[PDB]
Each structure stands twice: as C-alpha cells, then as structure tokens.
Amino acid sequence: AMHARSMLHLLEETLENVHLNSSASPPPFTAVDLGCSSGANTVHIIDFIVKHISKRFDAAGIDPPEFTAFFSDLPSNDFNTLFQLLPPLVSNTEECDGNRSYFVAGVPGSFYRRLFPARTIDFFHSAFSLHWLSQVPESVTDRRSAAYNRGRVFIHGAGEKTTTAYKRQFQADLAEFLRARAAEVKRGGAMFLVCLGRTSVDPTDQGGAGLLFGTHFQDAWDDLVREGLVAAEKRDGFNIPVYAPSLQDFKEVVDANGSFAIDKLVVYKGGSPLVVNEPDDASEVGRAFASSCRSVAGVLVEAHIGEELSNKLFSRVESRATSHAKDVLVNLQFFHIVASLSFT
Amino acid sequence: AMHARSMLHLLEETLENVHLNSSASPPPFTAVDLGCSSGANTVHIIDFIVKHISKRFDAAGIDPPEFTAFFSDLPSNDFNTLFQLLPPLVSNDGNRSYFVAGVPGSFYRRLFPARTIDFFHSAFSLHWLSQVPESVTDRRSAAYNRGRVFIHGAGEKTTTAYKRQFQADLAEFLRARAAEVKRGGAMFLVCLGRTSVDPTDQGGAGLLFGTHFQDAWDDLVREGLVAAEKRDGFNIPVYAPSLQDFKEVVDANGSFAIDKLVVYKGGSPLVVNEPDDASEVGRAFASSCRSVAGVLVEAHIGEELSNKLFSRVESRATSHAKDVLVNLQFFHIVASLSFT
Ligand SMILES: Nc1ncnc2c1ncn2[C@@H]1O[C@H](CSCC[C@H](N)C(=O)O)[C@@H](O)[C@H]1O
Ligand SMILES: Nc1ncnc2c1ncn2[C@@H]1O[C@H](CSCC[C@H](N)C(=O)O)[C@@H](O)[C@H]1O
Ligand SMILES: [Mg+2]
Ligand SMILES: [Mg+2]
C-alpha cells in the first residue's frame, strides 16, 4: 500500500494547476468523482480534494468557498450504500478525518456523455473506471463478423480483427467522454485521470488485465464447457467489456479532442492488486485472485449464465490460482496510466 | 383523482412567480424536490416543472437553459429504486431532458451552496417531525403521552410540545431554504393540515393515526406480546399544522414573501375500487398506515408483532367501514412563497 502516498502526489500536482478565483468572496467550488462506487475510496479522495483546495485558499489569506462534491456512476451503482457512508455536515461556529465540510450529491448516468450543465465543474476526478467499455463492441457480438471472439471470453488471447474492434470502442468512448468533460469544465479548471493500461504495442497483450481475465478466468470458462452446464457458442457469446490502453491509444484521443492541455502524462508500475496477508500461503493466493474477478465483473457472468453456475466458475478460478500460485505473485503486475489535464 | 388537475394549477401559478434570466443565454436552471421518495410522483412533478419553465422561455423566444433536478430525502430513502426509474437523457412523456442528482440529508438544515437554487418544491413531507419531541419521550415530563401512541387523543402539554417541534423544524427549514434560493426564485409548499384551532384535533391525521391504529395498539396490550409502558414509549412523530401555525413561522423568518396561502379539502387518501365493499375499506386504510410509518413500529416492536397490529387495524377499519368513507378527510395547506 506504500504507493498511494506517491499517487496522492500526482493528484496534488494537478490540484495546483487549477485557476482559483482571486476575489475576496470566491463562488462555490465544484468537484466530481467520475466512476465512484459505494466504497470509502470515493469519499476519501473527495475529502482530499476539498482539503487541498481549501489549504490553497488559506495560503492566499482567503476564506475557502463553499464546496459541492458530485459522486457519479451508472444508475446501477449502490448509491444507497454510498449515501450512508457520507459523514454529517459541520455544525456551528467540540469540533476537533471524521467529519464533512462540503455539500454532496450522487449523479446517475454514464460519463461517456453529458452529466452536467456547461462550464460548471472546477475539477473532474476519475480513477480505474475509464478502462470499462461503454459496451461490448457490436462487431465482436456478431457471429458472422471476423471480430467475433470465438473461444476466448476476452481479447488478451488473440485476434487482430477482435483487438482492433476493442481499441476503436475505447477511443470512441474516451472521445465522447472528453468532449463531454470539455463542455462541463470551468475556464480555469483541470482533470485528473487514472486508468489501467499496458506497455505492449499490440492490443493482444493486455498486460495486467490480460493476466486477470485471460488465464484462470477463461480456463474456468473452459472447464464449464469441458463439462456440461455450459455450451460452446455460449462462452463465445460472453465478452468482458474491458480495454487497457497504451500511451499511444490514450494520448491520440487527447490531441484529437484538443480542448484539454496535457500538463503531465505517465505510465508506471503500480502492480499487484491482491491483498495477501500470508504471502507463502498457496490458498490465499487463490481466493484473493478469485475475489478480484468477482468484484470486477461477477454481475455479468450471472446475467449470461446461472447464479449457481457462476459460483462453480468463480470456484474453479480460485482453485486454478492456488495451483499456479507461484506464477501469479510474480507475474501479476498492473500498469497504470495517469493524465493530468487542464482546460485551455 | 380529479383534484390533481386543480393542484397542478397552484404549482403553475408559483412557477410564474420566478424571475427568469432575460439574457439570450440564461445560466443553468436548478429545481429541487424536497422529500422525494422512490415512486413516480417525484419524477412527474420535476418533469412538469422543467416543462413549464421551458414553455415560458419559448414564450419570450429564448432557448431554454440547461436544467438540473435535485431529488432530496433522508439517507434511508431508496435512491437505488429512484435512480432506476429516471428516464434516460435525450440523444442527438417517456423521455428526460434535464440532468439529475440525488441528495442525501435532512432538509431541516442546509443541503446546497448559498444562492444556487431557482425553485424548491416539497409535497407531503413538512408534516414529519425531525424527531419526537424530547419532552414527550421523558417519562417524568407532563408531555409524556401515556396510553395514546399519538396527539389526536388529548393533552395540552403534549400537544403544545409537538407544535413547538413543528415550528422549530419548519423554522430551521425556512432558514436553510432562504440561504439557498436565487434572488428571483420561489418555493411551492404542500403538506397536510387541519382547521381545528386546538392541536388536540389533528383532522385527517387524527383519524388516520388516532382511531383504529392506536386501538390495535390497545389490543396488543389487552393481550400479551406488548407491555403498557411500551405503547406509551411509542410516538408517531407527525404534526398537522393549522394556518396560524404555518403562517406564523413564515413571517418570523421574513425572507420569503407570501404570494399565496391556502387551506382546502383534498380529502380521502384511499384508493377504493369497490366503494360498498366493507373489506376493501379495511386493507386500504391499513395499507396507508403501513406505507406511512410501518418501519417505526418494527424498530420498536417485533416484525411479526407488527404484522399482527397492522392486521388488527385492517380488521377494525372494515368493522366500522361506514364511519370511514364519510369521516376520513384530509385538509391540505399549500404555500406559494417567493424570495424578497
Ligand atoms: N460509463 C460509466 N459511467 C459512470 N461510471 C462508470 C461507467 N463505467 C464504469 N463506471 C464505474 O466505474 C467504477 C469502476 S471501479 C472504480 C472504483 C473507484 N473509482 C476507485 O478508485 O476505487 C465502477 O463503480 C463502475 O460502475
Ligand atoms: N427531514 C427530512 N429530510 C428529507 N426528507 C424527509 C425528511 N422528513 C421526511 N422526509 C421524506 O419525505 C417523504 C414524505 S412522503 C412524500 C412523497 C412525495 N413527496 C410525494 O409527493 O408523493 C418521505 O420520503 C421522507 O423520507
Ligand atoms: Mg468470447
Ligand atoms: Mg405514547
């Protein structure tokens, strides 16, 4: 976990690039967490954001403006849960983390399109969300197209016609997103983006996500077709709607939108997304690995397959991962891509 | 249901009182439904609001501005459900043409940044106390409501405890709202009220909570399963104001202008498809009580112990079904406020 202290730095830097209102009485400040969820991660970065902005204001001898935080995700996000975590609003002029000193709002809808009125947001934040395709590309779901991913469940495996269908899908999504964002930022505002990426030149090698969805996860899918309970043209009809861009893929769309300035762009290693308390323990490797896959896209498996038929798959992965626990602690690395954008 | 067409009129009128931005490119418009729920009622009035404002803009030959709708309620509200109902956003009835956001927190205090809201709407929510008054939950106070479950029955020290609690809540609410409306903005309020001068006679809410509902509470203590000091510790946190009670707090806050104030009869809150049917009168009656405060009963009593109470009311209501179709009337109070 000693890389979050390093990542909070990149965020600090983008936060510096934001044009603060000079006036003695600056108008309310708006911050948005895009692709929030229902966890505490969302509330903590919002906390961090308004905290730093306030500290800037104090550095110029100004009272911090009023703050609104928007928590944006798909209508299927568990806002109910999110809303119960939100700390209560500060009282009168016994005070002193813990409490909240900003207004809140949860925003339902896809961020691959407009979510807010024009020019009303100061700071957009997004983390580990932009790698989720708006949909499976139509062409890979068409049995007669060359992009139809027969026998893989994901694009790590192979198929140029399949891999380039995903990338196009990514770049359209991210284009729509950027256009939406540009219309919504204030003149002097900025954007912090972090999604997972890859270093591979070829979309067929999906780095981290490749080893997360393309090893034990499709092998379990292959063990439920080497059984009964699941058909062959069934696993072929299931496609994880996820693409991990390279710098090139990301950067292209940016200077093509041309609304945002690139203040900073970085690909690095923030590998190993498994909380493992006993490293040498072969079985903990299993359930950890499995538990990621579940939280990521377990809802999709059950919308395409049985709910108990999924518990046998997610039961085979966590059997696979322990078997091959050696090649996992060593080979499961995630590459990150961060973008620090400013408008104008 | 042929009184909603008449009530949509009062809303239309308030909507006319709002100062629309003159400019060719007016900034975003903000509308808030306070005390929204998860049903369709919320999404239709929002729809109505933005539809009227747009039509006004067109009447002056202006493109309507962008719209945001805020749906406010307590963090216990089923926002998940509410957000599934929301219609998708317009592409390049049915359809939606405004941005949405759901807002968790009590409206008896601040919910938004100063001067950012054009129109506040609230319907059938202001009559819910922010809490049972501390004094009526104190065994040693004279306001302790011994043997009633509600204030309809009796008790001046009990009834005046509620009223104070109402006025304090409504005060705090108004203060919050005043700091959040735009200079040229307006507020539409409707909750239930009474005509009675004496807080002891809670009109509609009196007959909803103070007849069969506490009688069933009296049949679960004339049994076992529930103690006597147990029904005395349970108190429906609801107050129906009179025009006095309401209007007082308004001109005491002094931020809003009263363009209109009305008490009227929008009685009978029971969907009954066979009127002469004695049993339909029961379950209708009972189902109201349930949707209203059934969560409170189970937080104070057993979940199956509540299904036997809400099972006695619906047995009581059918019994005197005659005195219910005729005596179950709700008085409403509406307030059309503008700022300045
Ligand atoms: N099109 C879209 N619009 C809004 N949210 C989306 C989205 N596509 C994916 N997401 C959301 O992005 C999230 C990815 S998981 C990210 C969790 C959080 N940002 C964190 O850093 O811990 C999910 O909650 C998912 O619902
Ligand atoms: N202090 C408070 N803050 C926010 N919402 C409140 C509240 N007290 C009560 N409410 C909400 O007000 C609602 C009363 S029922 C109102 C239904 C809706 N307004 C309609 O017209 O049909 C409930 O959903 C309740 O959660
Ligand atoms: Mg497939
Ligand atoms: Mg009592």
UniProtKB/Swiss-Prot annotation, chain B:
Binds 1 Mg(2+) ion per subunit. InterPro entries: MeTrfase_7, MeTrfase_capping, SAM-dependent_MTases_sf. Substrate binds at residues 124-128, 288. SUPFAM superfamilies: S-adenosyl-L-methionine-dependent methyltransferases. GO terms for biological process: auxin biosynthetic process; methylation; polarity specification of adaxial/abaxial axis. Expressed in seedling roots and leaves. Expressed in the stigma, funiculus, and vascular bundles in sepals, petals and stamens. Keywords: Magnesium, Metal-binding, Methyltransferase, S-adenosyl-L-methionine, Transferase. Disulfide bonds: none annotated. It is an enzyme of class 2 (transferase). S-adenosyl-L-methionine binds at residues 35-36, 41, 71-74, 106-108, 123-125. Its EC number is 2.1.1.278. It catalyses: (indol-3-yl)acetate + S-adenosyl-L-methionine = methyl (indol-3-yl)acetate + S-adenosyl-L-homocysteine. GO terms for molecular function: identical protein binding; indole acetic acid carboxyl methyltransferase activity; indole-3-acetate carboxyl methyltransferase activity; magnesium ion binding. Mg(2+) binds at residues 145, 149, 231-232, 234-235. Its cofactor is Mg(2+). Plant silencing IAMT1 are smaller than the wild-type, show epinastic leaves and smaller siliques, and have low fertility. Belongs to the methyltransferase superfamily. SABATH family. PANTHER family: S-ADENOSYL-L-METHIONINE:CARBOXYL METHYLTRANSFERASE FAMILY PROTEIN (PTHR31009). Homodimer. Catalyzes the methylation of the free carboxyl end of the plant hormone indole-3-acetic acid (IAA). Converts IAA to IAA methyl ester (MeIAA). Regulates IAA activities by IAA methylation. Methylation of IAA plays an important role in regulating plant development and auxin homeostasis. Required for correct leaf pattern formation. MeIAA seems to be an inactive form of IAA. This is Indole-3-acetate O-methyltransferase 1.
